[model samples]
Target: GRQKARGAATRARQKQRASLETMDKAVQRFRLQNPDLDSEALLTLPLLQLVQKLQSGELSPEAVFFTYLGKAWEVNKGTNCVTSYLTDCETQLSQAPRQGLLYGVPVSLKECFSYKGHDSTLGLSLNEGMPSESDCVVVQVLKLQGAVPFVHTNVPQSMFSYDCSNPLFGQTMNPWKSSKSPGGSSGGEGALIGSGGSPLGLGTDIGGSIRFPSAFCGICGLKPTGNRLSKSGLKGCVYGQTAVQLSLGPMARDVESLALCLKALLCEHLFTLDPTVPPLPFREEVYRSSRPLRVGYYETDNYTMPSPAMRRALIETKQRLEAAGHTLIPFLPNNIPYALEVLSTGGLFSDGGRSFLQNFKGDFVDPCLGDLILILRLPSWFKRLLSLLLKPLFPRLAAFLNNMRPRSAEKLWKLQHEIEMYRQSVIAQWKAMNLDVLLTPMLGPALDLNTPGRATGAVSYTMLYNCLDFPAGVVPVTTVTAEDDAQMELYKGYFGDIWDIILKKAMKNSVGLPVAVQCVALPWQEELCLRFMREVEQLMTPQKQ
Candidate 1:
């Protein structure tokens, strides 16, 4: 009787999911009927054009805001990108006076950011309806500058993983390729922006949270130095663990819009709102091309190898930069294995995974994460027992046990020290080489939807920048090909690591993913990062004019 009931329930759930999929197919069809309308083009539409439309009375702020808001709603049903929508955006857009760089643009906030009266769920069902009484400092700044915050986007359950899936909002799919992940904690922002649903959005990056999604989704993202932008009023899954403080930053579809958003954000005098942030307005002089810069390039990182497409993109970018007379140097970090270990276990679950578990108490964990949580819950004695019991069946069990041990608080603190030491060491190396910026693969290659967990670890490439608190930006350089997928299959040797093996296996048959490279500048060098990004953009996609 019990088996029969379980089967019936499963059937019902399957039926409901089938209905949702059918509806999503209809939405995709509707979106396709509108030909030659590139969503990316719409997303990158100049802020000046919007201003001109408003100034000439060709379009009201409310009109522009609602047009996108309605489309966002339409897309949200299919993509599950938005976690919460603003009930009062129309009213706010109507009354607000247009000013600043992003005058009348509609924006979405990542669910982790504090927005009064909206649930900042961070894609955890347990966090639903936890209304924040005050706007996150950055959100407040956006309001003060006349940007309409109409919605908040979804995230991974704990905002720790690259794949954006949670019980609260399901999963957000890549706008360009529905099966592939959009890239996360900021993934929802990436999808929304990439789909042309939002002009600009806010996302936070501790590791590759902002950069990966931006790169994967073919959008623009900026990770400013720690505390460069205020972090006061945001809520995160692991809130108080400041070992590697997360930096809040902007996401958009193009470089100029990204710059405009950053300029407006920094212009708010955030130091008054949060003293931790340095009081620095956007430096216009940094945007001006003064002299050619010396840049360091590394096609692969210390952890996983870059895909052929990513390697080609880095080489091509180097050629272009060198052709433009900027000196290019080859540089590699000293220790990537230690860096990956620190990132994976560094205060990730300081309270023995209690806080992370608490966020999902009432919710169903996504299948991929459920496995991880189960691994975390096993007792030390049971783990040993299981290692013996499953030894023959799973020969890797003992090795997994050794690598899976969570770090203690003392170890976490030590890891924090190591992170600082690594940062300083890399900085010293960069200074020794006289390089203004460093370039590397953002991730191995863009991952496809349903691509297995192996492809996920490539995040260390971008995450290392976060560990260093350096400013970084990603620009799309190339697309994957059949040859790339074929090469991914014949991988025999590992990089002497299990995660590396896992990553190689995951990249098999993933040829359609977009490839991108990272350009990183020193701390508090967002202006310089943006300028460098613009140069790369120009080289890759030269303007017709």
Candidate 2:
């Protein structure tokens, strides 16, 4: 099995390298043909401004596409994030109209989004060579909106882990520090955009995929409510885990870029392309509102305690918002450990890893997923014994072990009920607080490569929103300061869980990496969430003067 998997990986790499080389050649030829194209200048322009240039015929679609492709190639040489440079962009550009909102914008994508004639292998050998017959719903919308999807980025094996490495694409490194991960499962998008290689990209989130990468790489991302954006045709390892559905959203360098992309995606083309999506256009008034409102905030979510840098970002963001006339209220979430348990056991992995690991058959398992797969593969009796022995010393780990096993129909129903109950309770608390929005720390900054697996519990902060189906956005507020690094030495996490211990170890040398704060709003309030994120961006982004 290992031999077959390894063979597939080698072949996949061969095919991938061929496409990369072809793109490289194309980039060089295109540059020679269009010697006046300034890629650096193009990369710096905001999404809307770039669109204005394209729509006004000041810049051609082909010029912008190649400029981004060249930068993406450069970024990939260092970070190993790009899976393939799409060969279809020129075709799309030739057919592109002049009037769409995102005209001529080069968009990178998470590898799992199905592009016709391309394999969304999702880092699995078994999936190799099997291309989608048609484009994903979002891909269709992007083309219709005049956006050129130039590159496909990497994802973790089976698209289930936060760590970006997969047997197929290898590891994606943080642009800031090569030793650190860019974060995933949208990590490829995060890395590319963080490095200024791509202006905007589409990323998916379920249990922090978009937000974690955005935070780690110092970008802005919005994980809208599950139903806000269409999810049709995104390939994945698991198909039936419905309690906490995957959400699609935009990842970009700034909140304004994020808003622009969302505005473009929320058009009638998207709803017409995927009839299941609500026909709600981007709500301009909500995002434009300057009204003072009550905001709930917490430094630590109380499950996997935030590092000093994370807490510092939360504090700085809170103070900045307070100064900006928003009413700040201290809010501690209730029983975050329970929410995490419900998220992992009840929602995400309810089928025990059966659905997820099935894709790993004869595939080389990623190191990040090795522990999870090992636990899911363990026999019931052995897991029970392990849980029993681990209960006193590690109640949380033991609970995770016991609950991550396979479930019957009755057990699945009960977990679904628990998820609904949890959602209701969280909403009730929000209503009771009379809060218009909430702010909290994003996950601890870019983790050391391969260390994300060990600190998996740190995602509790972001996953809470996924389980509750809240619209959430993360904005880069600050970087890890020397003081935060010094304070990391004194930090002992709240739970002392194994994940917490590993998180502390991972935070070493984290100074100078981006730290971000999350802004959350009630369900269907993506515009409001982006509004708060924009507010933070305006207040905290280093002044250009």
Candidate 3:
């Protein structure tokens, strides 16, 4: 007989708790021992440096794994970012041959990646006992490459919010500021890596899942072009949607660490590991280029306005690039308004959110997410009435509601076609501008943790690439200062809607928190994207010291 839903959930939560205790014990055992190296040195070691030591026998595989696990325990005490442990990683590393780039190095994973026998809980009590019986292709490849998979991190309930909180796994906070989010759905990975628990991790992005956490947490992440990396056996809600492409990519502390993980994954051998992924190898020559390049940059995406600090980051980046002999043109695409319209309004409610809401399983939604989900479920007639009523008071939000409704199959197709048209239009413009890459501000110093809805709806900056199937990356530049925290002149933008007002309120008191800018390129230009990111990173003043 089949198990009841409640019965299954009950058993699953038990298994989930048991698995966590076991991993915790494993880490605890390591933490109690004397240190071979001080926490400061172990935590700051880059992946490449760790690899050299491991390969040279300066450190044992288990020793390196234990070093990271010890750090994991410390990070979890401050930020509840970890979900469960991959307990048999020692066994995997022991039996594994050390012939690959990541041999003996441990990598943290987002909650969605399924390792054999672990529940990919995705922050739900319903999935507790139901665990993967076999490794996902990503894990398989990582194992084959001799990488130790030591731990699984937390995520939003079914990868929903950029703010990493859910009932089952507790909430994850920024290492920089405990009040702020680490960023979701890969928020856990960002928090783990950003907090010095691990040097490399795998994260996913459909609409800023990877990049958002990387930016908000002040780390490096890339959302590669669709199919650029293997996605076989990855978990998520968007099972079959083809209009908005999602990419699985790497997150780390710097471009070199990001490239190390990327180069390891972009192997000809990966094709056989997951036939759906491309067999492209990492291109070294692109990084070797010392030539001057043409770049395009913009300040706003028309949906979410950049704050003063964010604008300053954007302008400083343009100045540095120009001073370094590259050319930058102010890029305002003809289709940005329509593109943002599709992603923010039409594309999300295409299925009327029934599909999106199914994963809650009666768990508590954050106040921020509650508003968005409620927007999706409101009756069309009542919503229309509100839209009409709010026009006098909230014109921008009113028009947004009027445009999005429970879409029919036919209407969904129309929205999909609209996205397709905008993507092609963007590509044509990319070539016309003769640009190698584009630069823009990351969303913010990150919104107030509780008000993710305020900025979560403002995914236009990162989601543009997802909606267009382009490659993009975020590199940390500077932090919010007292001057950045200073109040600006009152609302004066083109829209200056309620969102604008909320963001202005949210950005206050964010001094000393990290701020970053985004780099984007046309489809399949990931190498070019990284090249520009590395260049701009070198130009940052903080990096010089």
Candidate 4:
């Protein structure tokens, strides 16, 4: 029986491939029937404009759905970003409301989200044959707002690392460069939207899933406060680890689409369906307001030095805001190394990766995740001995390794307490600065394939906000240039440890990759985050030309 079950992964992928082929055939037939439809023009319109056209009866739902469906198929062939095309999309198009905020707009999804009858394997062979029974709360909200669900995308096996490769789905490539990673666990959403396959998609972030992929792929994304959105139906490798909770948010080609998607998802239907989430609809006046904001900015978090392009992106974005009349204050994070330890490693792997590693019991492991899984499986005694030996030479690495040891329940509680104290201190500093928002580099640049696992601490810039449970968003501000690569040749990070070496290697040959700055607001201040993101996008749009 077990031998027979080993074919599940193959069967699952074949089924998914067949499902996509079926959707392609359906799209071809629809296109033939409606030869007058301008698919190219429809793909070029923004998400908001597309919604207006659909709601006004200027475009039929089937025509728009098939148009995007064809584009998604075309892009998936190159990027390997789409996992499967939704079989019930035609049913969804038929049921879509005529007057809702996202009427007839097709949306992609990260693989971890639950869709009825579709497997959310997270790229694990263990979950290959198991299909979801119902849609997740987030999907339910999307459908209620007249959004058509079309495709599910790929992710890392455990979703703990930023690399996009996994055993089941193989790997997903960046839309811009096949050699570069798009970033994860939202990697597929980033690649799909970056390549113009989908107008908008859903992604989750505990550390930097949403922001990293968004930044690396040259798109826009948001990580709202933990309780701002519902996560009842999402699956993850780590369970019951609530000290640093995951957040679900929107990813799109532009900041405006993110705003519209959030607006639609924050409707009354969401509140009624999941009372666990607060009844706070999207605020319009806050986003539309034009008052000058006190903005804080920093080029590097000091744990991992950003590449030259990232530093330039932050500085240029800050200058643009200053020209637009917002005051920019130089601010550094309190302690990034500590956050990297307790907030990231301790909080995420308190059980010593027992929960996460369980998923890989009898499955293939991706090379990108191979070392990380091994590190998680280290013996406690050996880790302690290695930490002692490495402390004098590499204190940061030693401390990080030492922190990975399994913790007891009491130790976990202590870590939570420390996290709370750290959060309070950061909030105090924010109050002292009177900052409405903060601008910082999202990551160094688009990572080379299999590099994210080694340079895991590179996410410190975005994870700091996740640790604070604040709302954060990313907007593409610049691209890697020859000057950036030249500067990287002489770059030396703070510690100059293994992490720095890995980061330095990661930035090599990253020219023309997207560079972005992250915008963060206080807790429950998503509108402020989006407003700042839109401002950065608008100010930087002309510079890119």
Candidate 5:
């Protein structure tokens, strides 16, 4: 399989080169067409300011559009974030009104969104260059809000992994460190926005896809409750699977952009475009409320031991909140082992990974995914042997693998019922705690490029919320420091786990990587979640003193 994978890379390089040639020309053309759009500050302005400038006669929408387009190309040159330039933006911006919240702003789409005549290939060579014949609801809503979709970002081949590498578009490096990943399946969007390519961009999350990249790239992202924002036009694997639903949301350089982007997305106009979209307009009153609240936080989270940097982020966030006068609770969770069981064995691999792997299409499976492929292809007999052999040594991990077999339709229905039960249990737990927020580290620091997928199972810190279908956001709280790196080296994680060992190895040279903490709220409580994120952002800023 690895041998065939190398050949897959050969074809992928040729395919990637052609799109890049067009990308280069588009960058050069935009530079020449709008020399006045060369200001970095202009491209990074907050959403409201940009809209105000456009509405008042201070800035032209055309200039801002080109400015963001120019910046996207600039970011792509280093990070390989941009998959392809969305042609016909100038025509769209030419007739754009200067009044919407996102007016004249150039927005970036993940490769999965439907754009007229653009391929949502999702990194499979078989589907390469097959364009969508129409605009999806998200695109239409962006256009209605006067936002121009100027580019599409890359994704993992199966849109499943947290690492962003696909044979077709190649690996998208983190702008902070070229050798590190920017996180995925919204890796490209996180990579671009983190590099100052655009202040904000659209991304999706089924299992921390949005928040993972945002945290890894040291940016901000909100994984809104599923269907809170429309998902009608996005492309992804595992379609129609309800065990864990995929949702669309915004990724941004700051909490403000996420707040503003949410306001733009949760509009009557979007609901009109897709009646399936929930008609809950952005509630300014709820967002603007000056309510002090109770918060809960965790460290090591019962199973996986967080890296020193992750533990440090959690502690500092708690300290900062306590200093800001909000009550902090030491929260312990329930049903985590079962959550892991359902999400891993039942939800993600319910078909024993047949559907997940069938999308590979003879493409190169990145070495990073090597272990994952093995797990997907493991035999029942081997699993039983290993489960028995390793149960004493790796009880949790062995138990996880024992359930990694295909399920029948009747069994799947039962699994769905289990998932729903867990969701309600989590909701009830939140009610009992009377907590306004839950905070924890966002999956250690940026992992070394090409780390295997098996080691990432500790992300229940993130994937747990996805299981509950809750609104969660991540905010950069601090960067890794020398002291933080050395704080927990002696921690031999539970049950001879390789996860802590690998994470510690990754965290070794990560002295300056960004570290973030997650903030979460109940379903349909996105405003509350974002407000908590905004408060955290403000409290953590040094200048606020």
Candidate 6:
């Protein structure tokens, strides 16, 4: 019977092919009719307003869905932003609940997330057409809450790089500036949301994946603490490497919308469907602080100095909070340089690069990584011989040693231990400082898409939160300016090595890219993060004066 069912399924799929050409033409016509429209203009009506319009006979769900769906298609062609489109979204929209916060909204999933009957490629070309048998837990929750998964966005290969690039869907560029990256792994979502192609979307983060793109694209993203949201059924290159702590969460254009989406995901008893989740529903009251909260600010990580734009974002955020009567305190991170070194050595490949290599089984790796992998696979004697020969001839040879340091099992274990020790120490420090939240830069500054594989360890500022398993969010505070870039001229190297050089190069000509700051709260303190984000948002509003 199972074999018969499988045979029937194959036959059904073989006969199904819907040409979206009609929809494509419709979108082009719509774009022509409204040439001045951007994503923000489309979503200005808001999800609830759009849903009410559809439910009250003012508009049809199909019309609304197709309008955006078609716009999304147009955006994809222009930017190479989307990975997969759902031909069935029209049917799903027709059957959607008449009254729900996300009733008629079209949401896009990151390629790494599994949706029933949809291919879950983490942007690996090898997994391109392979579909999943069931939905990821979050997908199920979203469906239960009436959110339509209309498309799946692109991701970085192996979801490792901070800049979103993969062999399958190519690279996703910033919607505002094509030459700059949108931010990676979750970058496609960033570009989509930034372009107003989708009002809200889901993105996963391990090392600043969600935060980077959100920051880069001038959007709001939340990296909830580990296990706050279910991770069951998500596919990734390093599925079992939970030690470094990756999280899946939502990204949206504004803080209010972000809060609304989070509440919808956690408010519904849908978490019960996934036993792996802690059954903790969204708590509305946790965010309602009566008095001004205590906030901590760290201007720079001990390892590398943040670019002027990043530093300015921090300074501005601190000033706003302080002026609002919130107690803002300056804090120093203890031993962050050691933590970053440990993370790099232990995480780059705990599986000895086997899993990383598997993604390229039938295809070639990105040139930059391919060369590095070849270096890793070289014979010991040959490597030693080359090292001796290149020591004096190549000045970069010595720098490469520190840049590509790998850890043994014993060393990895020690690093893991150090990570836990650091988590405890930071928590203790936060408690002693009487802090409600911490503020820092998301990444040094915006990076140029033209220069791929730059800014290697800029994630240290954001990844540290992932390592500590704390809830962190990225909020766009400013854009780069001549004043900020000019400051780089006087910048002296901090670590004075390969990573520092890479950082400097990445920020060299970044004068007008988006800049964002991250606000972090204690584990399971997502509500706190949201409140602080809202407060910061209000302060930044033009009417605040």
TM-score of every prediction relative to native: 0.85, 0.97, 0.93, 0.97, 0.94, 0.86
Error of 2 at 362 (Å): 1.2
**lDDT of every predicted structure (CA atoms):** 0.71, 0.86, 0.78, 0.86, 0.79, 0.72
Tens-place lDDT digits, model 1, residues 1-545? 23433343354335334534543454366456644444454334565566566656666665566457656766666677876666566567776656545567788888888888766766555455457897889988887777888777878777877778765457788776776778887888888887778878889898788887898788778888877888888887765776667888888766777787888888644667777777888987887665798888887774567766777788988899999888899988667655554443444544446556666554566754536677666665675577677656544334344334555778777777877888899889889999888888777464655342434456668767776788998887667789867777665323435555666665555566667778899988898898888888778767500
Choose 4 or 6, whichever is better by TM-score.
Answer: 4
The candidate 3 region of ten consecutive residues with least summed lDDT is: 1-10
Among all windows of 10 consecutive residues in model 2, the one with the lowest summed lDDT is: 536-545
Candidate 5 residue 454 Cα shift, in angstroms, is 3.8
Over 297-340, each residue of candidate 4 has an lDDT whose tens digit, in order, gives 98888787888898898888889999999999998768878887
Model 2: per-residue lDDT, tens digit, 364-443? 77897748887888877787789889999888888878777677889888888888888889889888999999998889
In the predicted model 3, the residue pairs found to clash are 12-128, 12-129, 162-184
Candidate 3 residue runs with Cα over 4 Å from true position: 1-24, 27-35, 391-393, 488-494, 541-545
Looking at candidate 5, the ten consecutive residues that score lowest on lDDT are: 1-10
Clashing pairs in 5: none
Identify the superior model by lDDT, candidate 2 or candidate 3. 2
Candidate 6 per-residue lDDT, tens place, 79-175, comes to: 6678666656667776777665677778888977787777666655556556788888787777767778887787766777777776545678788
Give residue 74's error in model 4 in angstroms: 0.4
Ranking by lDDT: 4, 2, 5, 3, 6, 1
Per-residue lDDT of 452 in model 5: 29
Give the per-residue lDDT digits (tens) of candidate 5, residues 173-273. 88888888888889999999998887678999988999889988999999999889888867766656777778789998788788888898788878988
Model 3: lDDT equals 0.78
